[PDB]
Structure formats: structure tokens, C-alpha cells
Design a protein around this ligand. Structure first.
Ligand SMILES: [Mg+2]
Ligand SMILES: [Mg+2]
Ligand SMILES: [Mg+2]
Ligand SMILES: [Mg+2]
Ligand SMILES: [Mg+2]
Lengths: 392, 370, 387, 371, 133, 388
């Protein structure tokens, strides 16, 4: 068995563009015909280029290799050009290809990936959503609360919101008193709307310095938020641990992290008790597994991150399904719309839970035709900061 | 002077089955007649194999030896097969044999075991019990069961309202878990006032962050402790909970040997230690742990969810320990023993009969197999 | 797919008794037929009983479950009797069953187990042996050197020896001055006889206190031993780190450890740079893979421990094969003799290296026939201490 | 003032290829014509792609901005795509764009960049070189080349006899690795005496203990540094080696941004920081890193294994840095520059010309495309 | 380019005296004429004297040197008298002259100091005041 | 009792200039007539300016106060201008004025200042000197230094100090060259041969190195059992110095550039050093040095007063050392002969390697004001200097 061919797909996301501006898919083909699919989560560079990177790596590292040989492929890639240090640009490309090997590995073995990495633990995967729909859902506490009751009515048991003000290229910064008012207003009203029926997820984007993060945590504690996501920037977990020690709110982080090494530091410093790997970035399925076992040693759970396409969702689901310490799975609404059209058979969402596929590999296949029919035509990157300083 | 024979009683616990499904008893006999009783606290295997395990251990390590030689016997069993590391399967079987030795040692010397290990310090041992009959799910019905227990004289009550404990713990409490937990504390404190301490008796359910979240909503009701807030493998982690809350952390029902308790004390994981003398390593090992506890502003509160004999040893420790806080309590218990355990208004009174102070009735034990 | 029946084998090791007095095997069988094999490493009770515990455990948590459901199986077993703490008795039995489930998983995938756990990394596995015989090899440096010279000539690139005196039930203790003397002469003489052709693995059994170990390590550094094994007892890694920080010799430990929880503390404290799992005890193949992955995050390497049957050996080999941080693998001589006779096809040893089978699962099969024809007739336990 | 255009150059290094196989240059030019040059360090992919990546970053973050606005530029890039975390891929592109801005800023002031970031401190820069049955495996042959170097004026030499580095590092030194290493140190020390320091240049081969085994046998020869003893991910672990040995540990060639060097300094992982300016984040970011080292009894030694433009940036930082230890030095480097980098009796002499002090010969770079 | 002359100013602060009782100014000049201003924030002594200390430092460490050589200047001062340790008296004086050197550096490059130290990031600076009557 | 008058002397130091270029003395006078003497150790600014500084301080904090009121006086000065954090410039002046108050305090009580601050403990104080001469010389030739130490031993000295580790620059810390290493070991080796167990070696570096620089050197001196490694790295980060101190067996000694209890508290606590070297004309005064010595007793450290200036600082150092149980050794500029005698009314008592403390009140000796006035400083340099 040897990997032979790669195709890449850059797919623009249509309105209402939940989950971001574009997705990057990979298609790996063995010499004998077995097909794997994967998604690359990265935005350091235009999607045209990342695609070419995936191609360059696959030629340089993968072509002619047994996709069963994950360790070798990963190390070959990670150590290429004498670097061997966590770099998200590479690791995202790597995460993509590595998924698609697991897709092939499981297809060949006739088993779901999760039956190759410790076995099924959950029959259903608890799910959550951002609150989606001049005042609106992202800026007015009452409209967010109404948004939330709806979600609870659909059977969601967890909702996430970032009312904490803009995130800028000069972060961390200090919360304004308005930022503090709004935030607690969101918490107060949303909790009153949903009572015990659902957990609030405070989904910050690294806005604050440690001091600013404690100023805010102090105000949110009463509403029992299930977590404070990325209260400060990714570079120093040692500092994040000061926020985490201060508050009873669990701290959650990882969407901007990659490799086992970085999560090793998070765990050991006590920077977070909830890990949020994106499988399009963190290094692939086996690395995620490795990271999720590390969290078992440290009284910590996994809540895979998702603000990209359905294939990252597939890998997330694979991991979550065989993970004793899985807490919750992030969903784009109920995995409907473009998220179903891109699949050959859709992600199964029922009453607040993802139900894992029992099909081989990732459990679902990329509708290549739907993928080619939807090119990306914008010029922007997937996701971005505010480039003015934080108000004021 | 030497040990000769062993007999093992697997006994079934009749309804209401408070304290398990079965008990595992042991009887040690010497050359010249003396008899010791003891109990093993093991559940990682069927009680049938456990007794066979005890026999195996007795033959290899204990038979033909002086039961005065606790240290020798202990280290023999502990090191058997090149292990020499805490293992609750072995330690449980050992805790039973060693107990019996202290029954034989005391009786031989015509003194209770607690008069041999620093002498009496307490005439009465402050007791507490779980809330028994609903009572496990409704706040107000537990508040009732509490005020009834106060009328009987109890100064402390325990309850686990924090939800189900799975094989995948630690988890995060649900909002309902937090709500019922707090509601239980509010209502009960309301029913008992200053007359009775609250023992929040969790079963390692949570992660460290999960336990901090719950702790925050109980502090205000001054609970005497917060039992095993997380699992037991990393005391280092537990220490975060202990440092964050004003509620004392209590733990150790799942630990054994001085080595694990040592690490609990040094890391600051818990200020209340909960040895089960059917598991901890024996009575002599328990006393050393108590002494270690003196050096770290820590107290003992022996664990009991098994038979009267473990309990008997629990008492021997408590009676002669300056840093004793409270003793766990519970009928058919007094039936298995010759003389019953004396209870008077929230207080046990220790026997002054030699050894474990009491004797297992063997006729009753045999008459109730599991 | 569901687990159906279990058979246990208690197998006596015929002379020269290298690698212990008895072995304990397990044979798991699915409803549709697939057969998994496995070994249990446990000497806390006689083997006949360890066998019984294997069926008790199989019947409560295992029977009727999908052998693919390892996390479930393991956590049902770990959590039994309200414990959920490391325990070598339980984790011993769990290891064998789990191993055997991987055998099954692999046979059903048409794949070696390592190709399911990260994939082949090494085409060959470096091995090492104890110095054995043929005023003796265990207590005289010259005869030890001669032995090591013959081991090199056979292809070996590492030899292990323990000249630091008896290990007792009252450990830790202090080395006698003669203990230090003989210990050094061993290193000097063997090093003179192998040169740079082989690493010295100085393989103590938890004899000393932390002060004791430093007294000794100070005398051994000059000969560049590759490791100093289990210098102190296993209950406080925090203390072993005191030894590891002091000396240049790498400290290796683990044969008496189980679950990831205990190795986490070893890595984090710095107690060791070389983890020595025995897969008959450590908690199974997937657990060991998690442990090796953690060690990666800590500049640690794995060097699987073996003092038992060919089946622990087979799992050890499977782990090692897909482990990028693999250092070296314990052998019992060259896996000739009974270690060969007990397997359908023997372990392939070739010029100092083990070559992993490419057949599915653990890669070999127990010879049930041989195994039945060799029961343990004796009264002792596998290993023991001094009193 | 604003940036207008970028142009990339992939240039191939002819034999003996000392420095790599190809160099990746860039050229930023302002609306009103001032031209800056810069080099990108990227081996994680391939030249034409890395060049396009350069144009992509220039377009999205740099075009139309004032080149004086380094902080804004750097932060625009560092956070693009919602990243904001160290990344050699990005940081190696940002490094070459940032230098060129310094070249511009300098040119627009008639001053060398070093006169704007603290001023000259050194009139000359101490340089070292690698040694070039050979000089990488025979210790007697190494000492000869070492003696030659000393005879040319060099006062430091570097050699890596420690063994093959694999994609599965860190590993353990072989006994042969140990003996060869000590022999290199012993034979060379005998050849150069006190006239040249021994720079022992491992490539992260080892695990912490492995490194300690090796350090033990090397202390006697008073090596100036143990370079990159272990892999780059846990500086905490590296600091375990610094603490054990008397030999100063040096590291930094695989790191980038203030955040990672911050951690190296605070853990005590290394006392000699080896920034490569084609990768670390730029000239300003490097200055921040060298000041930080000043608070930690730590010095800088700009690593160089690429083209001349990084060397110029290395020289700029070094010239204005009070904690500068030694500079890596190395023909074709002359031909690529409008004027050659000046070297005399063991030292590099800093140019007084504005910007990076020299200019790229665009004509020669276009004449040597990489194949 | 080289530093020629210094001039000090002790200036008293008039009512309502928000900001202390007096300010201490320096004025550095280059042989070719470029002028740089700076303030010393030191009150460990009287101002007439702190002004003298300034002229002392400038005579020993600054005159003749290139005002761009900030590192050399700062280290000649920081280390003078075999000290090299945080001293508020010295550092307050160093700070004033150093400022002025920046004023000069800037003036000669025709750029704001901040354009040479990372460039503008803020087009406005958030400000706060004490409460006064 | 109240302070009234101050006089300052900027006294230049005659050849061979051992102990630096000039000394800055102060004379304080109370209203009723008692005189107190003291010295200021500071070279951040020229001495004329320093003297003027001393009068600024005396006029602002001391005039009208009772000189028994040290804590009041100390804290008034310490906090002048809302500063209240170490600052050698101020702390130097304060040290000089404070010394002199203790002269007055003792003279009033009719006791040596030492009999007030815990009382005599030593009848003689062990001394040591720098190896001085009278281009191959004593600072760069180990042999010539071995003769110097030989001569020093034949006078009764039981310790000699030297600095062969190369120049110290304004850009320290740095890395010792192989020649700095080779010379440093030679000095230690040779000197040790020439003195045997008769005298301790004092390695008297001046902050040259980085932590790792320090260790490289330390590894090569350990074998000559040096008594101390003085200031192996700069003074700013003691957390770093403590790294040198832990690695090596040589005791680390430092403090000649530190001041106030606050800066020595940190040194002790971090383990930066185990021998503290206060210059009493800089540390903050006599009572301060007492408090500091008392801390060192809590951290297994010892005192060993630094001196590279006038004889008045010496008197203060001797006052401290006499009443200190954890005293180790005392620096002497030669045998306290020459201008160190001429400047005093009765010279310092030096017999066979030991200083004998005076029993005269206050600082034990008086300044000869006429010898002080007849010796102005004509130069324009600073006491001690750096390389560049
Ligand atoms: Mg997010
Ligand atoms: Mg309980
Ligand atoms: Mg062993
Ligand atoms: Mg290198
Ligand atoms: Mg000195």
C-alpha cells in the first residue's frame, strides 16, 4: 500500500458563512484506489498558497509511503528543513494529510477510525453552538437570550457567545467598563432564559492581559459559566495559569495551539482544564489522541474546536467518540446547510447530540463535485483581528 | 509463640444492606490457642477469590511467625514477588491479617490495642452517619432525615448529592448537580443550625476545575468537609481544590500505606485523612499515618463502609489519637459481634476488653454466607 | 463482534530458568472465532490464583464486549470495586486481556498491531541481555567481562548486570564499601572488555536510599553506563529525581509501575529519562503507547522491560516498533530455547537486533500444545526479595 | 512615505555550497524610489513557493504602509488569520520584509540601522568559522584546519563531531559519539592553545540526560559553548543541562519572536542566544531579544547559515549590542553584494553606509537562478 | 557628529503648582549646531545642585561623543565610578541627557523619535488627570 | 542635644595611592561642642559635588536634630523627595553623616560605638590586604604575585587578595578568555605553593562575568581552596549570582556595590552570597550594617567589611566587626601605615596580621583636620573606574 496522488480543494463558504470564509480540503489516493479526505485549518496565508503547500509537502514527504506509518510521516514533515518546533503553517497542512491517512487506514480495515484508537466510548456526543441570528444577537444581551432559548428548544444544552469586545493585533488589552457591563449582562439574561437547561460558554478571543481577564472573571463567576475560553494570548501558558488559579470558572484553550509539546505546557502549568484542539491544526488524529491522554493525567477534558469545514468536524467526532474525557463538541448550528451538501451523507444531529457514523474511517465522504462547484473567489483570509488598538 | 491456622468467613449482609453487600472476615489462631479476628476491604475481585487470596498470603508470609513481629510480617507481604509499592488488592488482604495480629498481641498482653499505641486519649468518639431512609434526591426530605438524626444525638451527618459517579471521572458538574448540591446544604443547615456539622460526601466525581465550581456554592454553609472532590491518582491536583476553598478537603478511602498519605500531607491535598483500616495497611500503619498528620495540621476521620471488625480497629486508632476528628457510623452489625458496640448520643464508647475489644461470633458469621 | 470465552495457561519455565519460574498466558476467543493471545505479569499471589483473577475480570467487564472497545474495557476494569487507583494485581490481569484484544483487533484488520498504533518506525529493534553463566558471573568482575565479551561477539550492543548486592524487604539501604568496590570493578572490567562496542546497563533493584544511590553513582560515572536502573524504591518519584539531577548517568525505572498516572509523575518530577514498561503490568498496549507519547514531551525514551514469557515479549516488540522514542529492548538471551518452542514461529533475533513480525496482531501465536505440556509444579513466586 | 513594490530572487549557491543550496532575497521599494533589501529563511518548503508567500504577506500587510511603522507591520502579520503565536514559516518571511524596511529607514536618514537602534558600540566584530578520514570525523584532521584558522586570525572555531542527527531526536550519544567528541576537543585544544575558543556545535541530537553524559566529558577543554544540546520544544528541559555543566549552553537558531526567547532566558535554558535574523522576527525584534538577555547575564551570538543579507542584518544588531559575544562568519558572498563585507584578522568590520550598509547586486542574483 | 555644549534651566512652577514645585531642563548642542532638549526628574537633592550634576556627567561622559551612540553613553554613565547598579540620582540625570540625544537624533533624521523606535501605532493617546479644585 | 555644624574635606591621596584617588571626610559639630567624624564612599559624581551634596543633606535633615535619633534621621534622608529605594549616591552621603553621629553618640556615652551596638566580641580582627607592587608586574605575573604574597605572609597577614581575571568593562558581564582562565589558575596555583596553609586566597574579581562565565572560571579555581569568589557577576540580579554560588564549592562574597538592609536581605535570601562585603561608607551607616550583619546570622553568612577608600570608613568597619559574632576578615590597605596614619590623631593599631580595636570613644580615633586641609585633591578623575 502506497499513497500516490493528492487533489486539493479550496471551497468558498456561502451565506450566511457560519464557520468562516473558506474551507481547505485534501483528497489522498493510494495506488490501488482507496481514497482519504482531510481538511487543513490555517490562515497565515491565502488558501491558494496553503493548498500548494499541502501539495509540496505530499510530494516531499508522503508519495510512496504506507499511510499506516503515521509516526514516520509526521516526523518526516515536522523535521523537514531542520525545524522540529511547533509551527501552525506546517502543522495545519500536516493535520490535513494525517486525517486522510486515518480515513484510508480505517477504510482499509473496514472500521471507523475511533475503533482503531481505543474504541467507541460514546453513543452520542454532547453538542454546542455559537448563538447566531444597529442592535443584534452579538451586542444586545436580551436578543442573545432569546437566541439561546431557541437553541435550548432545539435541544442544545450549551451555547457560546463572545460579548467581550473586539480582539486586536495589539492584544492583550484591558476590558472597558462597557465591555464588563455587556459581558455580565449577557451572562445574567442568558442564564435567566435557560436556567439549568444549558451551560453558558464564554467564548473570548484572547482579548485580555492577565489582570484584565481577572477583572472580568470576577464579574462572571455568579452565573456559573462552564468556561472562560482563551482569556489571554497563546504565547505564554504560564501567564494563563494565573487567570485559571484565580477563578472558579474553568479556563478553556487550544484553538491556536499545535503539537503535543504545546499542550504539554498548558497542562503542566495548569493554564487550562479544558483543551480545545482543532484537528485541522493540532497535528492530526493520533496527536490529538496523544494530547487527550495527557489531559487524563491532569484532571482535564477535551472540547474539540471547530470554525471551519465538515471534515475537521469529522476528525473531531472521531476523537470525541473514543475519548473518556470528552466534554462537549462544537457545532456549526445543527450541521445542516452547506455542511450537509459537502458530505455524501450528512453529520447526524439529534436533540443536542452528534451521533457518530459507524462507516469506515472518518465515517463520511467528501462530495467532491459539490466541492469543485464552489470555488473560493474572495481575497480575504478565513479569520482576522481588529487592526486599531482596543477601545479607547 | 507462633501463628498456625487461618479460617475465612465470607458473609452476606442482610437488608437494608447498609455498608455493602458482603463482608470478608479472617480468624488467626496461634500455637498455644490465642485467637485474632480481622476484616479485609477488597472489591476489585469476587469475595470468594479474596478469601483464597488471604489464605495464600497467610501461608506464604504469616504462618509459623510471631504476630508481635508486625514490621517483619508487613514488609514480607508488601515485598512479596518483588513489588514493594502500594497496591490495594494486597494491602486490603494485609490490613485484615495485621488487624488480627493486634487482636492477638493485645489479648496476649491483657490490654486493648489502643493502650499499646500511645494509650487512651478519648473516653468518647464523636460519631457521624449517612442520611438513610426521596432522601438521596430531595433536599427537604434529607433536611428531615437530618433533624431526626440530631434527635438521636448525632453531631454530624453526611450526604452525596453531587450526581452520578462514572468510570470516566473526573467530570464537570451539571447546573442541576450544582443546584441540588447547594439546595441540600441550605435546607439541612436550616434544619440543624449549629447543632450538627455538614459532611459533603462526594465520590471522586469531578475534575479539579469542576470541584472548584461546586466548592464556591457550598462555602457559605460552613461544611465541615468536602470529601474526595476529584479522583485519587494525583494528590498534586487535589491540592488546588484544597487551596481555593475554605471548606476542608477530606480524602483517602481509596488510598493505602504511609507512602500515599505522606504525599497527600506534603502537597496540601487534604487536611482530613480517611483511612479504612481494612485497606490502609493495618492498625500499626494507620497510627504512623496519624502521626504524620500531626505534622501538617491534619486530622483523622476513619472510613467505614464494610463490617463491624474494620470498625472495631477504626475505634482502636481513634481512641489513642490526639488528632481524631470524627468516626463513621451506621442492627446486624451488633449481631456478628459477641458484645455489641456501645453508642450513646452521637458518641461511641471504646471497649476495654483486650485487643480489638470485641470478638466475632463465628456461629452467626457462618450462618450467613454470601 | 463480541468476546466469548477465555482460557488460562500456567506455564513452568524449564532450566536454566532465565526469565523467571513460571508464565501466565491468556487466550481470548470471539463469538465468530478470532483468537487473541496474551500474558499477565504478577507475582503478588501464586499463578494458579492470578489465573482465577483473569477469569473473574474477563467475566464481569470483558465477556460480550467488542474487543475494539479498549477504553471502555479498561475503564470498566480500572474502576471496579470503587477503586480507580493504580494497583499491580488488577493492572496485571488487565494487561494480558488487553494485549489479547489487540491481537484480535489486528487479526481482524489484517494488520500488525503497530500499524494501527502509529505505524512502523524501526525496521529493527536494538536489544540487550543480562550476563548469564553457561565465584561466578553474578559476583566476579572478570567472569562478567568474559560473558560480556561473548555477548558482543554474538551481536549484542548492550549488556545488563546488578553487582550492587542483595535487595531486601527493608530497602532502601546503604551500599557496603564492598558493594561500591565490586560495583565499580564490574564497570571497569566490562568496559575494558567491550570497549565502545557495547553500552553498560547497570541494573540495580531498588536497593538504596537517595543518599545511598549518590554514593554509588559517583563511582560509576567514569565508565559511561547508559543507565542506572531503579536506584531507589518506587513509592516517591520526587526522591528518585534527586538522584537523577545529581548524576550524569541516566536513571531508568518502571518495571514496578502501572498506569499512565504513575509515569506522569515520573516524567514531571524528572525521576527518569528512560521509562521501562513491562506490558504484562503497565496496563496494556494502548496504555503503554500513551505513556511513550508523554515521555516524548519530556526528553524521555522507552526501553520495555522483560522478565517473563514470550507474549509480554511480543507486545513489548509491538510497542517498540511504532515508538519514535524507543531506546532498547530487553531480551532473554536470543529468544532461543523455550521462548522459541512456545511460539508457532519464533521471535526473529539477528545480530543484536529483534526483527518485528509482519503477521497481524501481536505477530505470532502461542503454541497451546506446548503450553499445556508444561505446567508449573512448584510452590514459589516469580521473583522475590531478601529478609 | 509608503511602500510600493516587492521583487523576489531565488539565487542558487554554486559549489562548495557553504551556506545552503539557494538564497531567498527580497526587494522593497517606496513610491518615491528608496530601495531596501532583505533575506528570508525558509527550508520548510520550496523557493518559488516561499517567494510567493513573501509577495502574499507584502500585499496583505505591507503595501501602502509607512516602512517606519515596524510595530504596526509586525503585528498586522503576526496576527493575520487569527494566529498571533510564534511560527517560523511566517516569522521567516516577516524577517526578510522587516530588514528591508530597516534598510529603507536607514537610507532615509543617511545612517546605518545600528545608529538608530542604540548606536555603534563595537568598531570590530569577533568572528568564528566552521572547520572545512576528514575534518568532520577525524580529530587530528580537525586540529590542522583549526590551526590554519588561528593562523588566519580567527579566535574561535566550531565543529560538530557529536553524531548524525535523526528525525526522531532526541536520542542518546553512542560510546563512539562520546569518544570522538572528546578527541575533537582534546586534539584541537592542543593545536590552538589559548588562541581560539572551542564552539561545540551539536544539532539538538540528544535528550537531557544524553547531553549531560556528553557535557561531562567536555568540561576539561573549556569549550566556549555547548550549542543546541537538545530539541527546541521544552526550554525548561534544556535548563536542566545548563545547570549541570560548567559549559555555557547556546541555543536559538530554531526559535522566533520575543516570546520564545523570553522563556529561554527565564528558565535559564541558555546563556548565549543564537538568533538568525532571517527567521527570528527582524532587526527590531532581535534588539528587544538582546536587551532581554542583558537582564539575564546572557549574551548574543547571531547564527548564520544562509546568504549575505542575513549576515548584514546580523552585523547590524551585533555592532550596536553591549552583550555581543561572537559572530558567525564564512567568495560568492562578495559577488552578491555591491561592496564586500569587510574581514580582517579575525574580525568583521561594520560598514558605515546607510541601512544595512551594503546593497544586493540585483544583476548577479538574476543571473544565478536556482535549479 | 559630536556633542559640544550643555545648558541647564531650573524653572519654578507657578500657581496652582500642579506638577511639583520646579522643573529641571537641559539643552544639548552639537558642534554643527543641532539643539536637543530634555528634563531631569530628580529630587533627592536641591535643583541648583542636580543641575550641576548634569553638567558633571556631560563633561565626563557626553562631550565629544556621537549622540546616536546611546548604548555607549548610557554605559559610560551607568558604570562611571565603578557602580553599574540602579541609582535614582544618576539615572534621573542620564534620562534627561538621553532624551535630548533622542531629540537630536530625530532632528537630524527629520523624523519623530517614535518613527525610529518602531513607528507610530497610535494616532491618539488616551489621557488621565488627577482630581484638582 | 542638637547638631549644628558640618565641615567637608575633599582630601587627595598621596602616592602610591593605595585605596584610590581621594577621600571625602565629614566633621559634624553639636552645639555644646562634641565633634563627630565620618567618611562618604561615593564616585558617581566628582568629590567636590559630593561634598556639596553632604551639606545639602545635613542642612535638610540633620540640623537641629539629636544625633541619637538615627532611625528618624536615616528615614528622613532615605525618603527625601519621595524616593525611598536604594541609591548609592544618597546612601553614601547618609553613611558618612551617620558614622559621625555614632562618633558623637559614643563620645557622649564615653564608650566606643561598639560597646553600644552589642559590645566587644573580638580582641583582634583578622586582616587581609590586596597584593600591591612598589610589562611584567604583580597584576599579570603569577610568580611576581607569589613573591608579593610571600612577603605579605612574612608580616603576619593570613589572607591576600588578587584579581587576575582580566579587565572589567562598562559592558559586563562577559566571558573569560582562555588566557583569563589560564592566568587565574596560575595565580591561585603559584600563590598557594608560596604560602601553603599559612594564608587564605581571596579571589577578588570585580563583576566581570556572566553567570556561565563565572562557572567556567569557578571550575578551575576550586582546587586551591579559595576562601572567596568576590563579585563573580554584576550587582543588579542576585537571583543570578545565586546560580554561581550553588554550582561551585568556593564561597561567593559580594556587596561593595550594594546598600541598605533591603539589598542584602535579597542577597541572603536568594543565596547569592555567604560572605557580605559592606563598605560602611556606602551601606547606609553603622546601625544599618549592624541590622545587616544580624540578618546574615540567620542565613549562615558572615561579614567581611570592604575598604578601598579613606581611614575613616576603616574605623567604621572596625567598629562593626568588633561587635559581630559572624565576623570573618577585615580589609586593610597595607598595614594601615602612611597617609592612613598621618590622617589620624592616633594611627590604627596593626600587629601581626590583626587589627586591635581602639577603646577610645566613638569611632575610636579622631581625624587630623590640619593634615586633611593641607591635602586637597587637584585632579579631575573619579576614585575607581571601568574599561570601555
Ligand atoms: Mg473560539
Ligand atoms: Mg465514601
Ligand atoms: Mg530489573
Ligand atoms: Mg548549528
Ligand atoms: Mg573589591
Amino acid at each position: 500500500m502506497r499513497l500516490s496522488d493528492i487533489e486539493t480543494f479550496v471551497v468558498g463558504n456561502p451565506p450566511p458563512r457560519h464557520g468562516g470564509r473558506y474551507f481547505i480540503f485534501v483528497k489522498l489516493v493510494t495506488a490501488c484506489g482507496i481514497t482519504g479526505y482531510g481538511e487543513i485549518y490555517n490562515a497565515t496565508f491565502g488558501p491558494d498558497l496553503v493548498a500548494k503547500m499541502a501539495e509540496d509537502v505530499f510530494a516531499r514527504q508522503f508519495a510512496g509511503e504506507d499511510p499506516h506509518h503515521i509516526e514516520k510521516l509526521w516526523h518526516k514533515t515536522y523535521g523537514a528543513g531542520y525545524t522540529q518546533r511547533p509551527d501552525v503553517t506546517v502543522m495545519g497542512v500536516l493535520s490535513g494529510l494525517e486525517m486522510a491517512c486515518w480515513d484510508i487506514i480505517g477504510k482499509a480495515a473496514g472500521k471507523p477510525a475511533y475503533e482503531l484508537l481505543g474504541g467507541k466510548v460514546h453513543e452520542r456526543l454532547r453538542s454546542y453552538t455559537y448563538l447566531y441570528p444597529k442592535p443584534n444577537v452579538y451586542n444586545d444581551a436580551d436578543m442573545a437570550a432569546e437566541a439561546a432559548a431557541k437553541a435550548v428548544d432545539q435541544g442544545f444544552t450549551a451555547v457560546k457567545f463572545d460579548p467581550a469586545g473586539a480582539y486586536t493585533i495589539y492584544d492583550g488589552h484591558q476590558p472597558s467598563l462597557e465591555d464588563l457591563e455587556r459581558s455580565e449582562a449577557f451572562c445574567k439574561q442568558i442564564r435567566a432564559a435557560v436556567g439549568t437547561k444549558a451551560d453558558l460558554l464564554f467564548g473570548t478571543h484572547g482579548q485580555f492581559t492577565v489582570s484584565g481577564a481577572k477583572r472580568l472573571a470576577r464579574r462572571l463567576e455568579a452565573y456559573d459559566p462552564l468556561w472562560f475560553e482563551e482569556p489571554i494570548p497563546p504565547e505564554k501558558p504560564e501567564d494563563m495559569a494565573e487567570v485559571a488559579r484565580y477563578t472558579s470558572i474553568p479556563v478553556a484553550t487550544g484553538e491556536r495551539l499545535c503539537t503535543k509539546y504545546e499542550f504539554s505546557r498548558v497542562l503542566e502549568t495548569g493554564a487550562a482544564s479544558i483543551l480545545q484542539m482543532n484537528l485541522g491544526r493540532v497535528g492530526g488524529l493520533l496527536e490529538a489522541k496523544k494530547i487527550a491522554a495527557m489531559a487524563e493525567c491532569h484532571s482535564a477534558q477535551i472540547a474539540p474546536h471547530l470554525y471551519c469545514g465538515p471534515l475537521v468536524a469529522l476528525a473531531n467526532i472521531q476523537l470525541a467518540t473514543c475519548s473518556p474525557n470528552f466534554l462537549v463538541l462544537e457545532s456549526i448550528r445543527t450541521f445542516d446547510g452547506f455542511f450537509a451538501e459537502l458530505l455524501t451523507t450528512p453529520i447526524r444531529w439529534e436533540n443536542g447530540y452528534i451521533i457518530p457514523s459507524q462507516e469506515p474511517g472518518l465515517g463520511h465522504d467528501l462530495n467532491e463535485d459539490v466541492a469543485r462547484a464552489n470555488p473560493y473567489t474572495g481575497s480575504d483570509l478565513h479569520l482576522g483581528f481588529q487592526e486599531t488598538p482596543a477601545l479607547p
